[PDB]
Curated annotation (Swiss-Prot):
Belongs to the glycosyl hydr olase 62 family. One of its GO terms (molecular function) is alpha-L-arabinofuranosidase activity. The keyword Secreted applies. Involved in the degradation of xylan and is a key enzyme in the complete degradation of the plant cell wall. It has a specific arabinofuranose-debranching activity on xylan from gramineae. Acts synergistically with the xylanases and binds specifically to xylan. From small arabinoxylo-oligosides (ranging from arabinoxylotriose to arabinoxylohexaose), it liberates arabinose and, after prolonged incubation, the purified enzyme exhibits some xylanolytic activity as well. Its EC number is 3.2.1.55. The keyword Signal applies. Pathway: Glycan degradation; xylan degradation. This is Extracellular exo-alpha-L-arabinofuranosidase. The gene is abfB. One of its GO terms (cellular component) is extracellular region. It is found in: Secreted. Keywords: Carbohydrate metabolism, Glycosidase, Hydrolase, Lectin, Polysaccharide degradation, Secreted, Signal, Xylan degradation. One of its GO terms (biological process) is L-arabinose metabolic process. It catalyses: Hydrolysis of terminal non-reducing alpha-L-arabinofuranoside residues in alpha-L-arabinosides.
Length: 302
């Protein structure tokens, strides 16, 4: 019936799942749902000079991602979050960079990279001690409230909230600072999920380790509650070089746990946990913006 999250995570990994289309040096920052029995994946793109976004043509097996069409969005949605918002029967794509710090668009057909509505403000606030400003938003609702979580490349995690009845809409400028640590420990790539079958929420945050990017996990009993470190060191990570089972990459970086239910609750099944992540060749160097990031999938070994 129900499974619990392990205290120690062990994964197996695919190899590189796809190469970027001509003109891109990287595929990045994945968000994914199952839509009509197929994997639906949005991501950031990089040409090395600037970031854009794209969607893969829907595919049934991860092993077929390599042949999936890669469809550029004509208006960039960097570091996107995709979900179905059930109370209004509408799909939401939230992202960073444009007229506001965070932005969203809506659609009745999430497979179309250019079928999204006019951009609307999601968040208009500002944070201190950050070179980036607000970065890597995610959205998650319980039964009562819609939450915004984000990072700032600065060791902090931030949260905002509104009643679900007021979403889709603008969180405005206000936020709460919920976590504070070193820049390395709480860097970016924050994601939050409901653990199916448990009275528990799961937060993962990307950290900069000695050996590469990795994820630290935290749990809470409430989205407005305190977060308790779970697998939160480089030696005992949520997912990292230590436990990924990946050979092609020493980095486990910005992605999304695989969500079978596409809705706003961001529910994951702890019995069948999988992680769509970005990784890169250990030999790749140079400017961050030119790094050859690629998609991979981790599968939890039970
Ligand atoms: O163009 C800007 C982007 O580059 C920026 O993205 C962040 C840039 O810094 C990255 O972190 C660095 C990785 O390499 C390490 O050696 C450095 O210490 C880190 O700072 C981070 O991963 C990116 O998200 O955002 C703002 C854009 O204008
Ligand atoms: Ca994200
Ligand atoms: Cl809040």
């Amino acid at each position: 019936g129900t499974c619990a999250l392990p205290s120690t995570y062990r994964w197996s990994s695919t190899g590189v799942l796809a190469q970027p289309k001509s003109g891109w040096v990287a595929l990045k920052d994945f968000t994914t749902v199952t839509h009509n029995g197929r994997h639906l994946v949005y991501g950031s793109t990089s040409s090395g000079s600037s970031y854009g976004s794209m969607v893969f043509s829907p595919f049934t097996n991860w092993s077929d991602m390599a042949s999936a069409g890669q469809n550029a969005m004509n208006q960039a949605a960097v570091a996107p979050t995709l979900f179905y918002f059930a109370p209004k029967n509408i799909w939401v794509l939230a992202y960073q960079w444009g007229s506001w710090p965070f932005i969203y668009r809506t659609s009745s057909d999430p497979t179309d990279p250019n079928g999204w509505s006019a951009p609307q403000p999601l968040f208009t606030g500002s944070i201190s001690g950050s070179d980036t400003g607000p970065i890597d938003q995610t959205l998650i609702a319980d039964g009562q409230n819609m939450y915004l979580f984000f990072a700032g490349d600065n060791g902090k995690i931030y949260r905002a909230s509104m009643p679900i009845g007021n979403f889709p809409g603008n969180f405005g400028s206000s936020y709460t600072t919920i976590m504070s640590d070193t820049k390395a420990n709480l860097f970016e790539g924050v994601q939050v999920y409901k653990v199916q079958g448990q009275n528990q929420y799961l937060m993962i945050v990307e950290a900069m380790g000695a050996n590469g990017r990795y994820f630290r996990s935290f749990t809470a009993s409430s989205l407005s509650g305190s977060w308790t470190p779970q697998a939160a060191s480089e030696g005992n990570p949520f997912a990292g070089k230590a436990n990924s089972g990946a050979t092609w990459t020493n980095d486990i970086s910005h992605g999304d746990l695989v969500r079978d239910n596409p809705d706003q609750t961001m529910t994951v099944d702890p019995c069948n946990l999988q992680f769509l992540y970005q990784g890169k060749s250990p030999n790749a160097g140079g400017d961050y913006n030119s790094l050859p990031w690629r998609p991979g999938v981790l599968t939890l070994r039970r």
